[PDB]
Amino acid sequence: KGEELFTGVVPILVELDGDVNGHKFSVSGEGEGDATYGKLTLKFICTTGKLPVPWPTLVTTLVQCFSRYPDHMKRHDFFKSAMPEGYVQERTIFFKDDGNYKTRAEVKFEGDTLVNRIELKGIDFKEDGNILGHKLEYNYNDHQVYIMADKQKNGIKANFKIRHNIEDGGVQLADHYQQNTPIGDGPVLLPDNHYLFTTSTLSKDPNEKRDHMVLLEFVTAD
């Protein structure tokens, strides 16, 4: 199926075009994924200079098709079944007591490369808040994602919270609303409701002088 496109190591390209409170920025990312292990490694670069938001706030936006679905679950892997034509992924992300991101992405194969091409629009942020003021720690608290079928849109939806550590204490909440719809006309497996579990690790490359994020991620269904 589309699952057959994921039995090996797959190069990943990520491209993001963003505007948060008028700060226009661009992120490009490259790496690879191996769904057999649910493993992702990726380096992101802010190609327009300094990133105007903290890197952790972009993690969820910057490929759930790479999750390890155990054999008894492969039947519900909407994300792979939509390949290679892919799927649109849309989110609104509300930052508590601050602004919100609206994102639209196409995830699809371009040849042998899995590509995630994103537009991001952030509005109504506080210029001195936790996001625009760079007050978030450079780490991550993952959260499980309850993927639910949305029969009417022949796709899936989800809603989940991410907690971002604020420097010196406390947590900045990011309330995620998500929906995904297939791009192709093919047959697509609408899944039974289930969770995706993710563990992310953020680091830096000591040889990289541009504003950047190295990201290691494992994701598995259950």
Query: Residue 149 maps to which CATH number?
Result: 2.40.155.10
Q: What is the resolution of this structure in A?
A: 1.8
Cβ-based neighbours of 128, under 8 Å, separated by 6 or more: none
What's at 148, amino acid-wise? M
Structure tokens at 62: 């910057």
Q: First-to-last CA distance in the chain? A: 20
The whole-angstrom separation of Cα 67 and Cα 217 is 10
Experimentally, how was this structure solved? Answer: X-ray
Task: Determine the Cα–Cα distance for residues 204 and 55; give it in Å rounded to an integer.
Answer: 11
CB atoms within 10 A of CB 48: 17
Q: What is the number of domains present in the chain?
A: 1
Could you tell me the residue range of the domain that residue 15 belongs to?
2-221
